[PDB]
Amino acid sequence: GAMVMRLGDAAELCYNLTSSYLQIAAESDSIIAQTQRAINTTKSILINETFPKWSPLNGEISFSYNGGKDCQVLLLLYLSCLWEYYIVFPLTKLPTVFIDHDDTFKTLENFIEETSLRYSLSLYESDRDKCETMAEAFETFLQVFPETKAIVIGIRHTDPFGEHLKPIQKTAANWPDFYRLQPLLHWNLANIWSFLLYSNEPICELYRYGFTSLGNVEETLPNPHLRKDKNSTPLKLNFEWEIENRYKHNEVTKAEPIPIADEDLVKIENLHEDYYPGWYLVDDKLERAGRIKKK
Ligand SMILES: OC[C@H]1O[C@@H](O)[C@H](O)[C@@H](O)[C@@H]1O
Ligand SMILES: [Cl-]
After folding, report:
1. CATH number of the domain at 1-295, out of 3.40.1130.10, 3.40.50.620, 3.40.50.410, 3.40.50.1820?
2. How many angstroms is it from 287 CA to the middle of ligand 1?
3. Strand partners for 168
4. Which ligand lies nearest the alpha carbon of 278?
5. In a 10 Å sphere around its CB, with 0-12 CB exposed, 13-18 middle and 19+ buried, how is residue 232 labelled?
6. How far apart are CA 71 and CA 283, in angstroms?
7. E strands present in 34-126
8. How would you classify the pairing of strands 179-181 and 61-64?
9. From the CA of 54, how far away is ligand 1's center (Å)?
């Protein structure tokens, strides 16, 4: 039982849940309203600024997907926009690129594979056993796919190296030559959680265990700001409505969380502490707080 959707069905599903999110009744000072505004900006970037210039069909656009929450939100919106642009289906699998590393969480590896099957992506993975820079990995990716003109990148202004980015932007001089398409820059952490929880799509289950940012296995811990302690003020949930009223699937689109990898549960159990899930954090400045101390 691996949930598989043909690409067209996946795109239609994402259009429907995104449209449904946009129809949520919310007050003007709410996280949900702000997320609706962020969705509309993302849609404009893709439908108005991107697709008229580069084809998402003929190989001109590839999607950089690393299984994390930002990439996942962006993929859902990208699929929604493919449906909206072309219908509102000419493609069997969507070209996707993952830069793999030897210190990636096993649960994240599993999730990338699961989601590649779920959304009928055509996954290319760089070689995790090659010692090389990201630019080098993409240079090899361009040699395999020389038709690529632009790459969709799930990154936010609050992320490291996010400050001086724009929605459409050529790569650095030491990269292969393509346009970076960066339609998620204006999203905040709270918007990410709101949309992702409402979508009722499977997400990387590490977030459920207190992780807020998935760095590498050696550095990354559950966020200490989410550690449960009788002597700390309990944390309040900002996404109760989204969870309780999350998008209802049909028979063609049913979903289930996949449990974390055994090796990751062992690492979590060894901490002898419990954490609120990642969506109890909404402060962007503390997103990467869960880290091993280094000099
Ligand atoms: O304007 C950005 C891009 O738009 C595309 O439709 C053109 O074919 C490219 O030559 C150009 O770089
Ligand atoms: Cl993350």
Report:
1. 3.40.50.620
2. 36
3. 181
4. 2
5. exposed
6. 19
7. 61-64, 94-98, 121-125
8. unpaired
9. 7
